[PDB]
Structures are given as C-alpha cells and as structure tokens.
Design a protein around this ligand. Structure first.
Ligand SMILES: CC(C)=CCOc1cc(NC(=S)c2ccoc2C)ccc1Cl
Lengths: 525, 404
C-alpha cells in the first residue's frame, strides 16, 4: 500500500486526554454502527484500557439524511500535533495554464480514509463510544488511517497522492494532473476517446491503491468553476458578475461592489472604482446609506456595460513570447495587459500602489513594471517584453539621476498617449541673474524683497514647504532658492509630480511653470 | 563514516523561510542538479513531516557554462550552534599583493551529516504557477553554505593542506565557508602556477576559480578620504556647499573649523556672486583640507560587533561604500565603478570579499533599492558562494553629496 509518514507530537507534550461529552442513547447507537463498519474496514481498531488518551466524538446528521454521520473533535490533538510542510498554499492562476483538448476532474472519494497512519501515532487518536447502560462501560478505539479533521491529514494525503501519481505521470508525459484537495484535474491533447480512455486508466491506477473516483457518467465537466473562475479547455473567465440595480446603497453594499469590481480588473479592462470608493469617505456605520454622485453613477453604469459583455482570457502558449503593455489610466492609475498574440489577452490588470507620499510617473511606471515582473515569474516563470509609453531618453534621464538603483527589463517605447514625462527638472547649478530667495514662514532675497507670513495649524515640516511655496510664488521665471530644510529638499529633489499633500502639489504646479529652478540646502544656525 | 552530532543554538527551532519565485530556467537548472545529487545520495526527497525550509537559487559560474546551486542558509547558520581550535584570521592576507579564490564546496560532499540535523536543511524546488507540489529535499552530507560544514571538515582540511603550507609557506591560505583564499606576493605569473599546483594538490585528495576565476589584489586597496572642491574662483553657492559638507564632516574630525568660511557667507548675497577668499578663510580651508587627508584616528575593529556596509549610488556607473561598526567610525570607505542592479550586486560581492579578507567576516549591507527588485534580479548577477545579510533603505540626498 502506501508508505507511512512518521508523526510526532510537539516537543514536551502528551497526547489528548479529554472527556467524551454525554451522548444520547440514540446517538450512541448510531456511532456504534458507524464505528463497527469502520473496524470491519480496518480504519480503526478496538483498544485496551491501556490507552489513557481521548478525543471527543459526537453524531451529526448532515443536511439531507435521517442517517447519522460521525464527528470527532481533534482541536486538542491538533494543538498538540507537530507542524507539517504546508499543503499547496499557492495555486495556479488560469493565465498560467496551457490549453488542453480535454479536461477531466476526478473527485477522490474517501481520500484520507485510504491512507495508513504512523503506527506510533495511532494511540493519540483514541476516542470513546459511551455505553448506554451504566454499570456496563464504553468502547475504546484508535485510528488506523488519516482521521478526517486531523492536522496532518491534508498534507500527508497530498504527499501520498503524489507518490502514487508519479509512476503514471512518467508513463504518461502527454498528460497533466493538478492535485487540489480531493479533486484531481486532468488535461491532455488526446482525441476525445483517447483522452476519456486514459481517464479510465488513471481511475484504475488510483483504484489500485483503493482510491475511488466518479465515473464518466457522474464526473464534473468543464467549464470548471474553481476559486472564482470559469475554466474551459481552451479559455477562461471570472465566473458570472452581475451588478445590483438598487436605488439605495449602504457602505456595506458599496464595499462589496468595489470588492467585486476589484476582482474583475484582472480580466475586464477599464473597470474603475475611483468614484465608488470616494463614497466611503467619512462614513459612520456599515448600514449608513450614501447617495450616489453624478460621477459615481456614470462609473457604475460604465462598469455595468463592461461586465455585460463577457470576455475570456486565452491560455498560455509556452512556445510564444509574453508581451506586457502598460497605460496610465489616470493619476496614480495604471493598466496593463499581457498577451502573446496581439490583444489576445492572457491577463490584464491595474496598479494604483503609491509607494511614498510623493511620486512621479517615471517612478510609478517603473514600480508597475516591477509588480508585473514579479507576477509573471510566478505564472510563466519568465519576464515579458514590455511595451511602455515612455522614451528611453526620459527614462535614462530620470534613472541616471535618482539615488536609488533601478532596472527595467527589455522594453519597447510605444506611442500610446498619454506619454509619461518629467514635467520639470531642477537646475544642476545656481542660475545667473536669477533672484535668490533665502527662506526660513518667510523669505528674504538678494534684491531686498521679503514676506514673513505667519501660518496657523501648521506642522514643523509643513511650514518649511510653505516658505518655498512663497518664494516660488513670488519669483520670476528663474529662481534660486536656498533652504535649510533637508526634508523639503529631498522631496523636491525627488522631483515628484503627484502628492497626497495639497501644498506639495501647489509647488509642483509652480515648478512646472518655472524656466529653471535651482534648489540648495544649507546648515541651520 | 562517523557523523559528528550538531545541534541548533539552545531552545531554537529550525528555519521556515519562504522560497522566492524562480524563473523556469533556474528551476530547470536546479532540477537537473538535484536529480543527480540524489542519485549520488547527497540529498533525499522528504515527507510532509518536515515543516522546515531554506531558499535555493541557481547562479552561473564565471567562465563555466555550468550552473551552481546556491542555498540561502543564512537563517540556518544563525540558529546553528557556535563551534567549540579555530583557524583565526591571518592579518597577513590583506597585505599580500595577489590573492585568488577557489570554490572548495565539493569537499563537503564526502562527509555525512549527522542524521538528526538533516531535517533542518530542507529546501524546496518551486514549481511554475504552482501546478505541482514542489520537489522537497534535505541533505545527507555536509551542505555547501552551512556554517557547520567548514567547521566539521576543518580537520580533514588542515590535513590536506599541511604539506603545501610548509612546502610553500610563502603563501597564505584562508578558508571561509565554501571558499579558499590563496594569497602571495609572487609575480602574477608565478602566482597562477603555484595556484594551479594547489588545484591538483587538492585533486590528489578528491576547485574551479572564484571571482571570475580571476585575481584579487588586496595590497592596492585604500580608503576613499573625504574630499573638498579645489577650484579657481569661489561663488556663494560653492561656499555653502562647502560649509555644509564641512559641518557634516566636523562631527568626525572635530578639528574642522568653518568660522572664517561662514563669515564670507554673511548677508544675503546672490548665489552666483563670486567671493574672493580672505587670508584667514584661506588658511582655514587648508587646515580642514589637511585634517581630511587621512582616516580619523582611534577607530579599531571589534570582533564582537557587526560589520556594517552602506552603499550610495553616485551616478554614471559609480558607487560609494563605507564599512563601519559605529556611526561615523568607518573601518573602511571605498569606491566602485550594464545596469544599476548588476553593478550593485558586483559591488556588494566586492565589498563582502574584502570584509572576509580583511576581517574574516561578512558585513551587514544597507542597499539603495526596493526589495522586490533586488529579490528579482540579484541571482542573475551573483557569483559568490556565500550570501551577506542585507536590508533596504532610502538614501538621504545629502550623504551622497558628502561622498566622492
Ligand atoms: C487549476 C485547474 C482547476 C485546472 C484544470 O483546468 C484546466 C487546465 C488546463 N491546462 C493545464 S496546463 C492542466 C490540466 C490539468 O492540470 C493542469 C495544470 C486546461 C484547461 C482546463 Cl479547464
């Protein structure tokens, strides 16, 4: 059969020693029946009073039958069981797959119950079936196989399934299997019958080790609804997405919507949730009703239309290259789509991540490129060729002068407005015949000019930026500004073009307008 | 053979480090590599009853078309017991004119690893798009890159090197992890031959070159002193940049005075307005200039303290680094002059190699780059067999201004 996986309890801990709750003579009867069958099948074994351990058991009738189901509470044993290597915590994103002529999912009936348990560990799996009549005491058992509900069952099962599957996989490279909990998904490019044939070889190979699965008659067929998706043998999409037509919206409704709207973005290009999100400002309760703004209904309405028309992503062709294309959808908003054949989208997506209170498009687009790259390596194990709306000259100019190291794969400029550029650049050397402002909230110039404005509610850092703003404000098309604020300096030297702070945006505004600006720092006192 | 029992620092448990996503190419490489190491029993697949994990990478060998498997045993080494006879750091190495580095990691693969420690060496070969479980393994032999491996092989090592060491004691030989640092002052030609001989003198018992196979030259390493602008005329701006740098540097060399220079800065003059220098100011600058000509006195290296390194991107393919243990108290300072990441990684390896050679330990780096970027590309340019520790930072535009 299958090689047993040795298990141990966490160091310095003893097995579970927890009382069996009182049961109904009815439930006792049920369990005894259930447990006897199990013993006859070898899944468990009566034990002697030699075993001091115990885990509770109770009877449950699931939704549809006047028959009884057995439940054993392993919370305690689990708190006491060693950690295992994580079960598949990572999953396949649809755009990563290669299409197949046929796909078939095989539900593995009685998974865990078909796998032996480490002899030495069985003792900790002890439970008891109370006796109906008092003076006549209860039945003690221990598990011989993976206890459903136990800590290591999933991991140990996955593990075993793999060893079992290996051989077959080798005798059948023309076949692909993705294990996932109890299901087994199998794709091939074999002709229908040819495929449906192997599906049957497999079942046999599995049945060889007692594992049972559903018959062609009873199998689930593509499309495969899985993890919020709709998988066809040749294409994919997010399952069905319908937007409500309510006239009254609560913070919670809006949150759900934005959330569903978010989901869609990975495949439906152009979804926008900016205006909806705005509706959440200042909200005081989940049940608070917010009225939609002219701009928010347009968006909802616009999105509704997008979702009406289904779209479907194609699969990955490992024989062809990956192309990633990125566009600015708005300030802070970026969109991209990865395709191999022109517009033949594998995936698409957005990026709003603003890293730092201040930024410029060159910095952000670059980060966009990094997120996409990371994503790709995870899905296709390679980086895509990029199609970017920025010129190398621009890129190089920014790159070359930014303190942080950065690197963008191979990219090709694409003239798809809007084009990202630097709205301005600080002069590298002080400007001749340009007035010089010494700011500290006020300024003093080489030309005698001054303004000592006094702000209220202002922070220490925010007061510094104000001075500069003043200087900028009042100066001509060329200015030399001298400050002692290393903070302001860094901000501006970073050359942001967008900011969370209004003040900063005002300055940026001034900055774009100027002809040449030279900013310099000097020690305080 | 007989395995020497190794244990983690008391109370500590094994590593459970996440594996960073790998490119198919690197994945294919590691598979090829591990499949053969398995056939030869160096490694074995493992079960779910092992929860530990260490990251593996694939890097290229310089001047070799083969891939090297690189296991990030950084967290493991940290939780591994110290070792209680040591082969201390030969101060004589830094002085040597020429030094070559050789990868001797293959030596370890002849010594078994204590059966009870093996579990902690678990590492995993990731699968593209998670379509498969991920091949899980653990070591049976001493693994390359673990701090225990050099220790446990010390004996067997000194043995094989006693002859060359006495039949050639003009050569200094330092071992650090998978590396062997061979130093001398012979001619670069003599060096290469004496080297080759040790290669076979090693082959005799059972070493491709490291750091491009290439050479090293520790004699020619020098500190990058803080420098000042030496210019024709001095404008108001020039002088402010000057005072600022000076003021900053004053915290290290308290002998720096700015008084006279700060006096030329009275009034709110036009930044471009040239300022002739007074006599006092002229002497002041000169003195400051003299003080900076050499590293501050009093800075000694403490074996019990971490060795820190900071890098600054200057531009045009130029970087500046500083190795210290305490703020402003630099043990060393240097310069280094493709793409940003490729450079940085070459620099990091360079600075690490120096740390090893000079002090016998790796520095803890502070890099000016975003994590995801580094994680993404570092293995594409990396060639060392060791991995320094690192963290990521936001370089203050002033510090850069104050260097180079
Ligand atoms: C993740 C999942 C449910 C996969 C099964 O669905 C499909 C998977 C593929 N193609 C591949 S490469 C495949 C087949 C079995 O397992 C894998 C990873 C194609 C179409 C569908 Cl409908």
């Amino acid at each position: 059969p299958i090689e047993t996986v040795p298990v141990k309890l966490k160091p310095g801990m003893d097995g579970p020693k927890v009382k069996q709750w009182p049961l109904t003579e009815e439930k006792i009867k049920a369990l005894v029946e259930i447990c006897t069958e199990m013993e006859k099948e070898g899944k468990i074994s009566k034990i002697g009073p030699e075993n001091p351990y115990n885990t509770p058991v109770f009877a449950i009738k699931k939704k549809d039958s006047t028959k009884w189901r057995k439940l054993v509470d392993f919370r305690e044993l689990n708190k006491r069981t060693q950690d295992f290597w994580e079960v598949q915590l990572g999953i396949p994103h649809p755009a990563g797959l290669k299409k197949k002529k046929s796909a078939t999912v095989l539900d593995v009936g009685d998974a865990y119950f078909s796998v032996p348990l480490d002899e030495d560990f069985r003792k900790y799996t002890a439970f008891t079936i109370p006796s109906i009549n008092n003076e006549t005491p209860g039945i003690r058992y221990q598990y011989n196989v993976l206890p459903q509900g136990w800590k290591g069952s999933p991991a140990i099962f996955q593990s075993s399934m793999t060893k079992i599957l290996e051989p077959f996989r080798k005798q059948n490279p023309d076949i692909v299997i993705y294990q996932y909990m109890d299901d087994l998904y199998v794709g091939s490019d074999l002709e229908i019958g040819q495929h449906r044939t192997k599906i049957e070889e497999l079942r046999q190979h599995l049945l060889r080790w007692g594992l049972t699965t559903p018959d062609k008659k009873h199998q689930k067929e593509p499309p495969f609804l899985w993890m919020g998706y709709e998988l066809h043998p040749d294409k994919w999409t997010v399952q069905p997405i319908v937007l409500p037509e309510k006239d009254s919206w609560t913070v919670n409704d809006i949150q759900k919507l934005v959330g569903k709207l978010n989901w869609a973005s990975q495949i439906y290009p152009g979804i926008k949730v900016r205006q909806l999100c705005k509706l959440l400002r200042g909200t005081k309760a989940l049940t608070e009703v917010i009225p939609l703004t002219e701009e928010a209904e347009l968006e909802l309405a616009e999105n509704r239309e997008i979702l009406k028309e289904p779209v479907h992503g194609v699969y990955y062709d490992p024989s062809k290259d990956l192309i990633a294309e990125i566009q600015k959808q708005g300030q802070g908003q970026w969109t991209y789509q990865i395709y191999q054949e022109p517009f033949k989208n594998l995936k698409t997506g957005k990026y709003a991540r603003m890293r730092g209170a201040h930024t410029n498009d060159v910095k952000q687009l670059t980060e966009a490129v990094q997120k996409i790259t990371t994503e790709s390596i995870v899905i296709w194990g390679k980086t895509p060729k990029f199609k970017l709306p920025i010129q190398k000259e621009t890129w190089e100019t920014w790159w070359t002068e930014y303190w942080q190291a950065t690197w963008i794969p191979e990219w090709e400029f694409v003239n798809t407005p809007p084009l990202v550029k630097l709205w301005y650049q600080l002069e590298k050397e002080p400007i001749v015949g340009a007035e010089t402002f010494y700011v500290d909230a006020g300024y003093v110039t080489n030309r005698g000019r001054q303004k000592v404005v006094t702000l209220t509610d202002t922070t220490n850092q925010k007061t510094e930026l104000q001075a500069i703003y003043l200087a900028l404000q009042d100066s001509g098309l060329e200015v030399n500004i001298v400050t002692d604020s290393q903070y302001a300096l860094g901000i501006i030297q970073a050359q942001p073009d967008q900011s969370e702070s209004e003040l900063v945006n005002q300055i940026i505004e001034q900055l774009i307008k100027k002809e040449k600006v030279y900013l310099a720092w000097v020690p305080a006192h | 053979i007989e395995t020497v029992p190794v244990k983690l620092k008391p109370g500590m448990d094994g590593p459970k480090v996440k594996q960073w996503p790998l490119t198919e190419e690197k994945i294919k490489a590691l598979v090829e590599i591990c499949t053969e190491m398995e056939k030869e029993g160096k490694i074995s697949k493992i079960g779910p009853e092992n929860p530990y994990n260490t990251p593996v990478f694939a890097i290229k060998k310089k001047d070799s078309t083969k891939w090297r498997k690189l296991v990030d045993f950084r967290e493991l080494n940290k939780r591994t017991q110290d070792f209680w006879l040591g082969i201390p750091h030969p101060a004589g190495l830094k002085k040597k004119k020429s030094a070559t580095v050789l990868d001797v990691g293959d030596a370890y693969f002849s010594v078994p690893l204590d059966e009870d420690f093996r579990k902690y060496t678990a590492f995993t070969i990731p699968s593209i798009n998670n379509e498969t479980p991920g091949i899980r393994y653990q070591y049976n032999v001493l693994p390359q890159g673990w701090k225990g491996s050099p220790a446990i092989f010390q004996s067997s090592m000194t043995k094989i090197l006693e002859p060359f060491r006495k039949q050639n004691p003009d050569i200094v030989i330092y071992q650090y992890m998978d590396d062997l640092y061979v130093g001398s002052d012979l001619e670069i030609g003599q060096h290469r031959t004496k080297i080759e001989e040790l290669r076979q003198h090693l082959l005799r018992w059972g070493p491709p070159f490291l750091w491009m196979g290439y050479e090293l030259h520790p004699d020619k390493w020098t500190v990058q002193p803080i420098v000042l602008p030496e210019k024709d005329s001095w404008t108001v701006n020039d002088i402010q940049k000057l005072v600022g740098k000076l003021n900053w540097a004053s915290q290290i060399y308290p002998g720096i005075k700015v008084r006279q220079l700060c006096k030329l800065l009275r009034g709110t003059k036009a930044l471009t307005e040239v300022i002739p220098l007074t006599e006092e100011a002229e002497l002041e600058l000169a003195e400051n200039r003299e003080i900076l000509k050499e590293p501050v006195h009093g800075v000694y290296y403490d074996p019990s303290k971490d060795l820190i390194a900071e890098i600054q991107k200057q531009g045009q393919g130029q970087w500046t680094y500083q190795i210290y243990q305490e703020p402003f108290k630099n043990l060393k300072t240097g310069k280094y002059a493709t793409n940003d990441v490729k450079q940085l990684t070459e620099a990091v390896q360079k600075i690490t190699t120096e740390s090893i050679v000079i002090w016998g330990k790796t520095p803890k780096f502070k890099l000016p780059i975003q994590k995801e970027t580094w994680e993404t590309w570092w293995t594409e340019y990396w060639q060392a067999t060791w991995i320094p520790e690192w963290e990521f930072v936001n370089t203050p535009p002033l510090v850069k201004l104050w260097y180079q």
